[PDB]
A paper describes a structure:
Here, we identify an endoribonuclease, precursor of 21U RNA 5′-end cleavage holoenzyme (PUCH), that initiates piRNA processing in the nematode Caenorhabditis elegans. Genetic and biochemical studies show that PUCH, a trimer of Schlafen-like-domain proteins (SLFL proteins), executes 5′-end piRNA precursor cleavage. We also demonstrate how PUCH interacts with PETISCO, a complex that binds to piRNA precursors, and that this interaction enhances piRNA production in vivo.
Author numbering:
A (entry chain A): 115 to 314
B (entry chain B): 85 to 96
Write the structure that this text describes.
Amino acid sequence: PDSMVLLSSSWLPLNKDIEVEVVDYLPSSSVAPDLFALTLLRINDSSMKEKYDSMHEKMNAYAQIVPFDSELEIGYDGVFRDAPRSVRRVRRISATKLYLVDFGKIINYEKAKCFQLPKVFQSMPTRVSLCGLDGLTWSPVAIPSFDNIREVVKKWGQMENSTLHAMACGFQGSINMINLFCGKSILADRLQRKGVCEYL
Amino acid sequence: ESLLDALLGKAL
């Protein structure tokens, strides 16, 4: 049978300021219903840049891209080939959607363009980082707004005309517990100020 | 009222 592949995700450095882009939400079984989760893509990280760029070069040149006997199972990983020598790593996050785990973009599931992820390309974690907003107890009435809040947060850096920064405060399973901020504008502080959540 | 305030206000 086909091997069911699930890439781990990139860790953020503890108590270290990093530059991040808020990307499309990658769901994880490791997020509690009342944890405000979000997906970050650390940017301007030269250490990993050459590694990811090298991976994509080899993936595009890879000869032995094999198809699934059956198909990519939901929740698991393979590759998406949108054209010859254009190959990227994906997770089938739902029946109709793939997630480009190294770019932070959701695209439509195309059965014919999906192939297995070769073992040699399973060593790099997803470039995106699974994250959760640290230090908060959310009002139950607010939890339904998490999607809307994520959309706002995705555009926050653009509206600030600034690169957002993050700092991992800890780790809960596979989730980076982070603060997200732009200068003195701290996400948890502005949410807490609206009374939809309280500090732990 | 910050910029992010306004953003969050519409989401809520």
